[PDB]
Design a protein around this ligand. Structure first.
Ligand code: CYC
Ligand code: CYC
Ligand code: CYC
Ligand code: CYC
Ligand code: CYC
Ligand code: CYC
Ligand code: CYC
Ligand code: CYC
Lengths: 160, 160, 96, 68, 161, 161, 160, 161, 161, 160, 160
């Protein structure tokens, strides 16, 4: 979070919190209300967002749901939708925390090794996250849509 | 400044700026419109606030202008007043800048090593910057005082 | 503290310790030793030469140490070899 | 396998080190090709400048003989 | 280390749930108590050194620790204090800025009893000094912000002893 | 290194002048446009590998550089050239964010020229790759940050050449 | 090669060639002629091996030759078979050298970054090399086929 | 490094010659002045802080060097200049005690002028400071070892210039 | 390093065609020269110390250099010279077994002249010692390996001079 | 042995064994019965080799059996012969192992300091080892004689 | 010498000269008179000490004068006596210098390689040094003889 990233940074120099750091912590606590509201709005519509994102992903990359596809079958498709739900949850965690620190440790470090072991298309997963971003920004006002989509673009860039 | 502090960390860790780092970089600028007049107001008092703080400090500590004192003589007093002006200019520079960068990089890293061959009282500079912060805030409003107080706290929090 | 009051008292103690001894080398020794206290007291600023700061990273805290604490230690013997003057060179060289 | 022969100076501007701060502030030393990038990045990060770099050991063709 | 924001996320991620009303209420409480904490942090800063001096005079000095045999008898043992302290401040000012014990248990109060047992260092004295600092900071900070600073200081003292 | 802000601070501290109307005008001119800098930097960070891909495809590969006798020949040299590609892109983004090529001079151009001379790197090929980077970045970011992004790529190309 | 490996190993220890090290060199020089025969055989059958490897790879992995595949069209498929020819040449170089130093310095170090930049399926390239090994095994004696298959399997493992 | 005894011993070892009458006179000439060297070194080492304090008042401070745009401007540069002065004083004491500038050439002068050229430090200002320290040392030590102390400061100044 | 096989591999790699009949002939020739090469290397490794002894007795000891005022004077300098001699013998054996003087250049011949001039080591005497090792190996090893041994032995002398 | 060297290097670089290392292992296992036969011949002729080795050493260096000699006396010469038997056993160990790790860990590391402790001539011991080399090669065919000679020369070079 | 070691150690400690090192300086300058007196007392009888040491070395070690030894021949004996004169020069150098710094640099470091390449008995040279110890001690007073005997015994340890 912003608090963790600020306090530990002013602890590696053996000084108190910087007068420059008795700021953006301030903007974080000021915008925490909006962050909580945006996270709640995303959480209420988790099933619809996941379903529509999976639909768009399966149209745009139909090879994955073909017989030679990693997600071929009803339960392999259920697992793909479960992964999309996991990443939506991580995005909400990032939104509430105000930093991508929690999502980074939870679902990004080693994701390349995991998906290479499972033989899953990482570009396909990234496109699924993009579809989730589109469906999420369709349900939000412009400022909140930009704020959520900025984390969504972080996920897309990191899975790369 | 804040941009320098963020880019230094980003290049040290060999990565682009973060998803919580740009939120702070953008919030550093949106209050710059307000802060420009805040640091501006202290600018056109620079030869007056120090002049008054001389009258707040060397009567409080009268051994600074006594025969066993370091500031005996008109030219010796002029040096201490010029040092106060230097500190006022640097704190205004940091107010315009963001993080502790302008003061710490120029006239804060090595205060003790300077005065080690200078014989100038650090506990006296403590009260000097205390009085500087004491007299430089009444020119501002409480809204500006809240955006000026931490910037003044760093001198007496660092030299200690 | 009256620092000037204490320094003059230290001077009186040094001189009076001098009066006891016959200045073979022993009266000089006491004067030299008590002069160390006054000399390493006065300046006000060479005294307390900051705290040696050990800078840390984002995972562990950064530390500080009083200067006098390591000044009463075994003084840290180190090994350093000087030889960039020249690979191909010009200076005094020799083997050292 | 090849070592670059370089010379450079690196000033420390945050701590003012106080014992024989001269041999660590201007040096020439052979540094391996695999470690040259990490060695040279440190000078730029600290703020010093590299005065010169030389191939010395290896040939410009590379291909075989690069590994070591 | 952890704050409230990170703690809620961590104990809601292990069970794999989205943030519900209870988690939102806890985050709401921290966000509502997010300004007095920042003000009291700046108040603790700057006036840190006078706080340490007052705490030392109130608890440490004028006791066994200063006469011959004490663990603060000479200079450099007096100097290892103010140091030793400035921690227990610094830290727990971090705690009452990212409020959670966490930091106090991971960085300061962890093996400290072992270090003190191997280096002398009267633990009862160094905890009485903590409570003196608690009293002085409660005096300086204010009526309402005196609490939660009292909370983190009590956590530090209790954990040490 | 320096940005526009700290460049103004140092440029006034060198003669000991307080911030005047002209200096505050420079700071205002920097502050009014950096938000587009933030958006362009975010877009570049999200599309870093794609920009390198199109720049290499347009300027370097499908040529004698990737064939035997070329400098980019063999997977080791290919990975080295793409890492240099990424480094140029990242430092260009840093320079555009800071609004000053001081970081580019301090950590990019210092030693790169005679380093490439001693290594056999084709400086014309690197310049062409940098301009392909600038073309792709200007296409991606849009009119708002196109010239600000492109000026530092031109700075890198001119320093190398 | 074996000679450079033994010489580097001796030079690192700053001692002369150990008896086992000399026995290794003597065995390699005695067995060089068989490696030369392997190299000439693979060289004169280079084009048939590449064509059959391409056929096997396209049968195994239709996704590479597809509307969204990395190799769609004529020049893409030409480049894929060209890369197979490069790896065949590297295999011949390794067979003549008796070790994998030239192969490592030419075509595996950095190949992961290169193929990630080009977005070519590394498992697809490994499948192509495996098909190349299967084709090459049908044009050599059993001991000679095993000798070539050692380096083919080395390439397969290295592209992993 | 080498002292008088080590230098003469090496100069005879290179010829493979036994210690002759002239070597005996050289060694005796060193030996007769041994005690005054120890006394002057003790005098320097006892009050070196006051010596550097006085020497800073005559050569560099109260000038454009300490103002903005000066080399010694800012806390870091000022402390670095005083550390360099202490380096010069201590190594001059070593050279005086060993009776040979060889340590000065080995561990002070080597790389120093090009380092100051790269850093922009005023060599003339450093020479003036070294000479002012030389007068302070010559005044303190007295007639007995004033010239002997001053010759090594002269060697330092001549090597720098 | 680059042996004969690696050199042919690089020669075809920079031009980008397969191995040819000429390459087959060269590799076959080097394979034919293998056994006698190994035998000569084994003999030289067996009689390494004897070769240095005869070379010293023929060109190095009992001369002016083995007396006071010489670079060979003092046991440390003589040990350094004999260790350099062993270095020449070992790297000559390595190059003889490899077939190419790339090791002789990069690991041995690279530098070795600026360092010698800086140290003051005579170079004509070193070349004479290298030739002395040349006649010693000429008698120790059979005539089959004499010419190829002599060419790598002359390579070091030509590079040094 | 060769297996230990290859496995140790592969583990140190954290990788599977290279094809060149596998080829050296194959050659080593191929030469196993020949190495065993050579070692059997030497161990059968262990006493005669030692006796004529002692005779050659005493003829070359009668000073060692002189009054100022390290091995002056019948029991001192018995100890010299016992060290000789030790080194012959080490040579047989090295011959069966195919390399010099057992010989190194048993009889050269620290041998300089040990023989300095005992005030014994290291060149005399090396000459005795050379006498053993002659006597042993006198009982073996040319290839096996050369193979044993490599280890004998390694011992002589190590004692140096 | 003494001053060199004192300054090197103090500089490595990164401090001024300690009173301890000042003590060794102030006493070495005083004792240089006795050191020099020992110097010409040994130098006057340099040749006689070497000759008598060589004679008693020859009587104590007949093995060096043997068919395998290096002493058969008046030329070889002269070469040995010249080495003895070199070492008496070295010991008088160390005596005048007060530290053994010149002796180590001149004639002990690499002397093992010296006498291994030249095939000379290091224990025999040590016995000659002991004989020379006796001859030099026979012409000096007891305290002075012990002072020279420290360096002679250090040489006896050095060739070991
Ligand atoms: C002081 C009278 C003048 C002055 C000096 C100044 N020096 C530096 C920086 C360095 N000084 C040294 C010195 C030494 N290194 C050694 O090894 C020795 C002898 C053992 C010496 C004397 C070096 C190498 C540096 C560079 C590294 C470092 O900073 O420690 C500075 C700082 C320059 C900067 O900001 O980069 C200054 C200012 N300045 C004046 O105005 C005086 C004339
Ligand atoms: C002061 C009220 C009490 C006291 C203390 C005392 N402490 C030391 C020495 C050390 N104290 C520490 C402490 C810490 N290290 C950490 O990392 C943290 C948390 C982040 C703490 C609290 C350590 C490690 C040491 C030893 C090393 C050092 O000194 O830095 C001393 C010195 C003991 C000595 O002389 O050896 C003293 C005296 N003394 C009192 O009288 C009080 C009870
Ligand atoms: C790529 C577009 C071109 C190219 C490049 C190439 N570079 C190297 C090797 C190095 N490149 C660097 C670069 C930098 N050091 C820095 O500090 C910075 C900025 C922060 C840069 C950009 C360095 C240090 C090296 C040497 C060490 C290393 O390889 O990492 C090579 C390899 C040369 C070789 O094989 O020896 C290559 C090929 N090649 C092309 O064809 C393009 C035109
Ligand atoms: C074919 C079986 C697979 C495949 C391959 C593919 N490769 C490219 C492009 C390139 N391949 C290389 C290769 C090398 N350069 C070297 O130095 C070496 C080592 C000897 C090799 C193997 C290079 C340099 C390129 C770039 C173009 C050029 O050569 O100039 C492509 C084209 C990718 C694109 O985006 O255009 C493809 C498709 N594709 C498959 O589906 C197979 C798994
Ligand atoms: C003032 C409240 C106290 C005080 C001060 C005092 N200062 C001096 C002399 C100097 N002060 C400086 C300061 C700086 N140099 C830098 O680079 C910076 C950073 C921007 C600073 C602040 C310098 C350089 C000097 C020396 C003179 C010069 O200008 O070069 C004096 C005079 C000391 C003397 O011996 O004359 C004094 C008295 N004295 C007090 O009592 C106050 C508590
Ligand atoms: C010998 C025939 C002649 C001779 C030589 C001599 N050399 C030195 C010192 C050095 N020699 C080297 C050599 C190398 N370093 C390497 O890395 C390599 C290749 C791998 C070589 C060849 C170096 C660097 C040194 C300096 C460090 C050291 O001494 O080991 C000396 C000693 C000089 C001194 O006292 O400083 C001598 C005497 N001298 C002769 O008279 C011979 C003709
Ligand atoms: C005599 C007690 C022993 C002995 C000695 C012996 N020495 C040689 C030959 C040489 N000895 C040296 C010695 C030195 N060079 C140095 O730099 C130093 C340090 C000052 C020393 C001691 C040298 C260089 C030689 C070579 C000839 C020369 O000086 O030019 C021999 C001759 C060996 C030969 O093969 O001819 C001998 C015999 N022999 C004994 O038996 C004693 C134990
Ligand atoms: C052997 C070296 C050494 C000394 C000298 C030393 C002194 C010493 N004096 C102290 C306090 C104190 N010292 C004094 C007073 C004085 N101090 C003087 O040197 C004057 C004689 C006098 C003023 C005229 C006072 C009043 C205090 C209480 C703290 C305070 O001033 O608030 C303390 C703090 C602990 C305490 O209260 O006892 C120290 C460390 N400790 C050491 O290890």
């Amino acid at each position: 979070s912003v608090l963790t990233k600020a306090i530990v940074n002013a602890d590696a120099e053996a000084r108190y919190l910087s007068p420059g750091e008795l700021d953006r912590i301030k903007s974080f606590v000021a915008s925490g209300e909006r962050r909580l509201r945006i996270a709640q709005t995303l959480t209420e519509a988790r099933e619809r967002i996941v379903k529509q994102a999976g639909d768009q992903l399966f149209q745009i990359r139909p090879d994955v749901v073909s017989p030679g596809g990693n997600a071929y079958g009803e339960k392999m498709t259920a697992l793909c939708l479960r992964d999309l739900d996991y990443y939506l949850r991580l995005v909400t965690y990032g939104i509430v925390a105000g930093d991508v620190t929690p999502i980074e440790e939870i679902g990004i470090i080693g994701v390349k090794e995991m998906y290479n072991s499972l033989q899953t298309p990482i570009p396909a997963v990234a496109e699924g996250v993009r579809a989730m971003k589109n469906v999420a920004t369709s349900l939000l006002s412009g400022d909140d849509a930009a704020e959520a989509g900025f984390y969504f673009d972080y996920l897309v860039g990191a899975m790369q | 400044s804040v941009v320098l502090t963020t880019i230094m960390n980003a290049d040290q860790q060999l990565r682009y700026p973060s998803v919580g780092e740009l939120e702070q970089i953008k919030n550093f600028m949106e209050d710059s419109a307000l802060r420009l007049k805040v640091a501006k107001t202290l600018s056109d008092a620079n030869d007056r606030v120090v002049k008054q703080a001389s009258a707040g400090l060397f009567q409080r500590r009268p051994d600074l202008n006594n025969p066993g004192g370091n500031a005996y003589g008109e030219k010796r007093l002029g040096s201490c007043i010029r040092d106060l002006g230097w500190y006022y200019r640097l704190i205004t520079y940091s107010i315009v800048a963001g993080n502790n960068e302008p003061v710490e990089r120029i006239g804060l890293t090595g205060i003790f090593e300077m005065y080690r061959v200078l014989e100038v009282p650090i506990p006296a500079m403590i009260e000097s910057m205390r009085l500087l912060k004491k007299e430089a805030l009444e020119l501002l409003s409480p809204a500006e005082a809240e955006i000026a107080a931490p910037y003044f706290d760093y001198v007496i929090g660092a030299m200690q | 503290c009256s620092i000037s009051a204490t320094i003059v008292a230290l001077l009186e103690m040094r001189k009076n310790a001098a009066r006891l001894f016959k200045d073979e080398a022993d009266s000089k020794l006491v004067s030299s030793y008590i002069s160390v206290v006054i000399r390493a007291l006065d300046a006000d600023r060479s005294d307390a030469p900051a705290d040696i700061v050990r800078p840390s990273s984002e995972d562990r805290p950064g530390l500080t140490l009083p200067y006098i604490y390591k000044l009463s230690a075994d003084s840290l013997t180190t090994f350093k070899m000087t030889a960039i003057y020249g690979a191909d060179g010009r200076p005094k060289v020799n083997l050292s | 396998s090849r070592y670059f022969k370089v010379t450079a100076c690196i000033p420390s501007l945050k701590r003012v080190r106080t014992g024989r701060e001269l041999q660590n502030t201007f040096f020439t030393k052979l540094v391996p090709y695999e470690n040259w990038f990490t060695e040279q990045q440190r000078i730029q990060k600290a703020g010093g400048k590299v005065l010169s770099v030389k191939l010395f050991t290896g040939v410009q063709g590379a291909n075989t003989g690069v590994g070591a | 280390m952890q704050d409230a924001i990170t703690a809620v996320i961590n104990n809601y991620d292990v069970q794999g749930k989205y943030l519900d009303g209870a988690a939102l209420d806890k985050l709401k409480a921290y966000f509502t108590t997010g300004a007095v904490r920042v003000r009291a942090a700046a108040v603790i800063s700057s006036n840190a050194t006078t706080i340490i001096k007052e705490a030392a005079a109130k608890a440490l000095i004028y006791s066994d620790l200063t006469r011959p045999g004490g663990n603060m008898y000479t200079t450099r043992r007096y100097a290892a204090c103010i140091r030793d302290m400035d921690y227990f401040l610094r830290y727990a000012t971090y705690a009452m800025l990212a409020g959670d014990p966490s930091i106090l248990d991971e960085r300061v109060l962890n093996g400290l009893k072992e270090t003190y047992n191997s280096l002398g260092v009267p633990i009862a004295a160094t905890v009485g000094g903590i409570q003196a600092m608690k009293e002085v900071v409660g005096g300086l900070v204010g009526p309402d912000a005196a609490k939660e600073a009292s909370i983190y200081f009590d956590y530090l003292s209790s954990g040490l002893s």
